[PDB]
Design a protein around this ligand. Structure first.
Ligand SMILES: NC1=N[C@](c2ccc(OC(F)F)cc2)([C@@H]2C[C@H]2C(=O)c2cncc(Cl)c2)CO1
Ligand code: NA
Ligand code: NA
Length: 374
């Protein structure tokens, strides 16, 4: 409890391409880099020589592979992966010193899934069985890990933005990774890591929307999404307020829609024209909330001889997505045992001399249960 030095710095990443952890599959162990994804629930790995892949799972080389004689087809947008299900022995070299027999989807065909030039070859879906493919009887990796070992039923993530890195602490918390106190919001339902946002402020100014809008049709914490994604109506209200706060300088209308970048010469980014963004989350106690605050350092993503940034807040039709834009400000504790998610100021988040990311409570917020969409 509290200190896991061997897992510190076990994540690496390229900006906008997610964070991955080294894993091994099969016997003898085959090493793969695997995207850490709290927004899905399948352990799926490249298993054929796709040109983009540095490497892939060669089941024929594993004496411990067991075929489940079942295929899985997984469309989404944009894209798809298809694979064959089995089990095999899985370890995390810079994780707990255990080995688990986990479900693995061997990806044999995909479209717009693997990224050309990325250093990961599969994804580790850390969410719950209710969104596993093909169905909730395919036990997710972390469920198997907890069933078969004594690893406590929780993990935590410190994503450090900018080559990026960070830490996945499996089975506990490392208090070096955060400053101040952890604040917890309930996991509303175990499918995604679903939470309830109860108030949104831009530079301290309330958007004053019916809070059910903030969670239309859900709000999730998702390490496998780059952006803060906001439901359309909330996004419209949000940019408008951000546009207004930031009007000392003017930017193309397309910038706010992510359709073009904006640049400034090096050292010349005007952070302070941009507002902070505060999400109040449902607390642990009736009528009690807390708030997490992020900087433009978080929602202006670095991507000419200038520092060009992408606006990393974007509209959504799947509800709010707290992606790397949120998570890079905080140490985030996925406290599965207590069905709650803790947030604390991250010891590694990017800021400036004037503003820091923040986690503050308690606040008095009534009718928070009304904020959840049904
Ligand atoms: N959270 C989420 N993960 C995704 C995903 C795609 C299929 C699934 O199938 C699953 F059921 F196996 C699951 C998740 C993508 C893997 C992520 C991805 O491609 C990505 C690209 N750039 C940056 C990041 Cl941070 C991630 C879609 O959104
Ligand atoms: Na256990
Ligand atoms: Na600390």
């Amino acid at each position: 409890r509290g200190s896991f030095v061997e897992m510190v710095d076990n994540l690496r990443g390229k900006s906008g391409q997610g964070y991955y952890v080294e894993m091994t599959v099969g016997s003898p162990p085959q090493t793969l880099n695997i995207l850490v994804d709290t927004g899905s629930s399948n352990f799926a790995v490249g298993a054929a020589p796709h040109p983009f892949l540095h490497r892939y799972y060669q089941r024929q080389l594993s004496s411990t592979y067991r075929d489940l004689r079942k295929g899985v087809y997984v469309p989404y947008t944009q894209g798809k992966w298809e694979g064959e299900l089995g089990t095999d022995l899985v370890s995390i070299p810079h994780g707990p010193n255990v080995t688990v027999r986990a479900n693995i989807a061997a990806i044999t065909e995909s479209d717009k899934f693997f990224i050309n030039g990325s250093n990961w070859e599969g994804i580790l879906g850390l969410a719950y069985a209710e969104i596993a493919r093909p169905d909730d009887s395919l036990e997710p990796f972390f469920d198997s890990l907890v069933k078969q070992t004594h690893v406590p039923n929780l993990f935590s993530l410190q994503l450090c933005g900018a080559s990026v890195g960070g830490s996945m602490i499996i089975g506990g918390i490392d208090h070096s990774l955060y400053t101040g106190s952890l604040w917890y919001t309930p996991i509303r339902r175990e499918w995604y890591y679903e939470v309830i946002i109860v108030r949104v402020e831009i530079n301290g100014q309330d958007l004053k929307m019916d809070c059910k809008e903030y969670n239309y049709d859900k709000s999730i914490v998702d390490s496998g999404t780059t952006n803060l994604r906001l439901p359309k109506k909330v996004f419209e209200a949000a940019v408008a307020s951000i546009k207004a706060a930031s009007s000392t300088e003017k930017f193309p209308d397309g910038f706010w829609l992510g359709e073009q970048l904006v640049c400034w010469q090096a050292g010349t980014t005007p952070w302070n024209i941009f507002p902070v963004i505060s999400l109040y989350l449902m607390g642990e106690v009736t009528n009690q909330s807390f708030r997490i605050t992020i900087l433009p350092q978080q929602y202006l993503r670095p991507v000419s001889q200038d520092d060009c940034y992408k606006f990393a807040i974007s509209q959504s039709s799947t509800g709010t997505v707290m992606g790397a834009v949120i998570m890079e400000g905080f140490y985030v504790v996925f406290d599965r045992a207590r069905k709650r998610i803790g947030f604390a100021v991250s010891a590694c988040h990017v800021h400036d001399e004037f503003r820091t990311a923040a986690v503050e409570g308690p606040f008095v917020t009534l009718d928070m249960e009304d904020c959840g969409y049904n």
